[PDB]
């Protein structure tokens, strides 16, 4: 009360509800703790298994393999017949029905497509892996063709421009990586409207799809198309040629995958699926 304050008056803005957009600005909040500097540890080893690094980094989702489904060869196949057709975007839905109990439904996504779904743009390469489950006395030959844009609505030429050939006489496990090649820099993220999504690959023996015709066109969300064609139909040491063999594939994300700005499309979704449809 002794002196008088001689200081220029400053200009301030009163904020009631704070800044709820950024993530690198300190907050004006109160901790309901006995002390202002209480904190646990952020280490992961305190619970058990040693961690390989940061288990909260997003690269742990881009880089975990997942079995999607399987298709079949059916050796009664001519010189060039379609066996597999898929787009090259990471949102590959997989519906199912409850076996025992009341009627229930649900979807399922690979780790690549479960982490990019909150965001709105995606970019990078994805690696597919094929494994044929067959005996060692089997001989056949297939080819893989990649079309960056448009699609493969008709059987293409055998040219070696982008064709990779795989034969059963060498091995039965292959893996290829489709990398980013588009004029634009970022594609969009696919979404579904109803509880039964549309097919992004054919055929599938798990979901019950038996179609073997090329699909539609989704160029705004996909990196292209990948199709599998037969070259030399396989023969088994049985004589009775009325049999088949199946082959299954896995999807991952190459160490160049990345995402972009945030999005809100999972607002009306929930991970609890087992008590609806009354």
């Amino acid at each position: 009360c002794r002196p008088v304050v001689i200081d220029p008056p400053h200009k301030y803005r009163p904020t009631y509800v704070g800044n709820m957009a950024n993530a690198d600005i300190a907050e004006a909040v109160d901790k309901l703790s006995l002390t202002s500097k209480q904190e646990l540890t952020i280490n992961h080893d305190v619970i058990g298994k040693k961690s390989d690094g940061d288990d909260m980094h997003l690269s742990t989702f881009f880089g975990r393999e997942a079995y999607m489904d399987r298709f079949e060869w059916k050796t009664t196949d001519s010189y060039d017949t379609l066996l597999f057709y898929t787009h090259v975007h990471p949102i590959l839905f997989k519906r199912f029905e409850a076996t025992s109990g009341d009627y229930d439904v649900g979807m399922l996504l690979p780790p690549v497509g479960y982490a990019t779904i909150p965001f709105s743009f995606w970019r990078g390469g994805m690696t597919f892996r094929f494994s044929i489950v067959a005996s060692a006395f089997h001989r056949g030959r297939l080819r893989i063709v990649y079309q960056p844009q448009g699609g493969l609505g008709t059987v293409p030429g055998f040219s070696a421009a982008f064709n990779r050939v795989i034969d059963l006489g060498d091995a039965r496990d292959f893996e290829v990586t489709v990398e980013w090649n588009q004029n634009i820099a970022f594609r969009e993220v696919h979404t579904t409207g109803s509880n039964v999504p549309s097919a992004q690959y054919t055929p599938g023996l798990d979901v019950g799809r038996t179609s073997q015709l090329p699909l539609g066109d989704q160029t705004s969300v996909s990196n292209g198309v990948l199709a599998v064609y037969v070259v030399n139909d396989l023969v088994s040491p049985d004589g009775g040629t009325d049999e088949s063999v199946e082959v299954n594939w896995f999807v991952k994300g190459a160490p160049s995958f990345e995402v972009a700005s945030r999005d809100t499309k999972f607002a009306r979704w929930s991970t609890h699926w087992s008590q609806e449809e009354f």
Partner: protein
Amino acid sequence: GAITLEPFGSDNTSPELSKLHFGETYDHMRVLVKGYNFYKAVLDNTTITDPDNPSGTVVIRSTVPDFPAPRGHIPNGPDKPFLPHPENAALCTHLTWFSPCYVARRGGIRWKYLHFGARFGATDAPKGLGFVNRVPQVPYGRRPLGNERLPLTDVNGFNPTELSQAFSNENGGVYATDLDVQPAIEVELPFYSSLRFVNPRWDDYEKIGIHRHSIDLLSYRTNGAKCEDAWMAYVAAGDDFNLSWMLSCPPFRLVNL
């Protein structure tokens, strides 16, 4: 075998791409989960079915768990808990989407409550007082989850006897404010458990609700047969929030209430 074929193309991205199309880089979930999302709205419409609810200058109390729960018809839903299918009327935030993939969860949670509400019929009343307080664990006498309406008036006027039995000792921690000059509460809730971590894949309301907290509102000229008061919940992740082991991505579906 495992033959690596020839890649379809090559990656030759410029080292300066984060400053040509977007502003920054989105690769860490820990940073992303620190923004705010909109959770449900905390109403109180379960109690109005009573035939003797107080009317006029009462205390509205709601006890809720301090972690978001998945939406839908979860086992112990709060919204309509007196009919065969109770439900949760929230939205799937970023916390309740990336969590079910993990094994261990530990850390504090940040909440923001914003008050609103009119008085249908009569003109209006000044906004009362708002409190947020922790509910700690006790072997006997703990506050159950749900809503309650306590009266604090007598034949003459305010009575300290029923006023003291509406507020507990308030020792664990509290934040109190006047809603006329500051209609918002921003709070942080720590972990405070005797066992190292909890299971993120829980879906029953009560199993999550072993860590509770309460929101209290003092109101004037209310009605015992209609609720006109609410809060707006915004949930973020605290500084010590941690998820430890990524197991697998669970299934989901599209649910409309």
